[PDB]
Amino acid sequence: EGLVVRCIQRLAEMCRSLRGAARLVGEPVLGAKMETAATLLRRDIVFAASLYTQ
RNA sequence: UUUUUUUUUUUUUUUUUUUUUUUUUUCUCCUCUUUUUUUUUUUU
């Protein structure tokens, strides 16, 4: 479980980039399920990163 | 005996206004027959 988190943060970028395409076309049927996936993917272990973040 | 790297949720907020129910048409139009008109009066 070291490459799973990196695969996750690679997937979330393309799902964050499909919204701009659905908005460009004008088809929010997919642009809504991409927003739901984007909010359904964000966990807290992903953002842990380093020790002295803040 | 299968390594290394590929960032992410638009920036902004400390804008004035001194009025008053309604609202605006329809034309001139043959009234039939015992009458002058009776009348005081009293019991409410």
From Swiss-Prot:
Report the subcellular localization.
Answer: Nucleus; Cytoplasm
Which domain of life does the protein's organism represent?
Answer: Eukaryota
Q: Fill in the subunit field for this protein.
A: Component of the SKI complex which consists of SKIC2, SKIC3 and SKIC8. Interacts with HBS1L isoform 2.
Q: Which family does it belong to?
A: Belongs to the helicase family. SKI2 subfamily.
Functional summary from the UniProt entry: Helicase component of the SKI complex, a multiprotein complex that assists the RNA-degrading exosome during the mRNA decay and quality-control pathways. The SKI complex catalyzes mRNA extraction from 80S ribosomal complexes in the 3'-5' direction and channels mRNA to the cytosolic exosome for degradation. SKI-mediated extraction of mRNA from stalled ribosomes allow binding of the Pelota-HBS1L complex and subsequent ribosome disassembly by ABCE1 for ribosome recycling. In the nucleus, the SKI complex associates with transcriptionally active genes in a manner dependent on PAF1 complex (PAF1C).
Question: What clinical condition is it connected to?
Answer: Trichohepatoenteric syndrome 2: A syndrome characterized by intrauterine growth retardation, severe diarrhea in infancy requiring total parenteral nutrition, facial dysmorphism, immunodeficiency, and hair abnormalities, mostly trichorrhexis nodosa. Hepatic involvement contributes to the poor prognosis of affected patients.
**What protein is this chain from?**
Superkiller complex protein 2
The organism encoding this protein is Homo sapiens
What gene does this protein come from? SKIC2
Q: Span of the full-length protein shown?
A: 1193 to 1246 of 1246
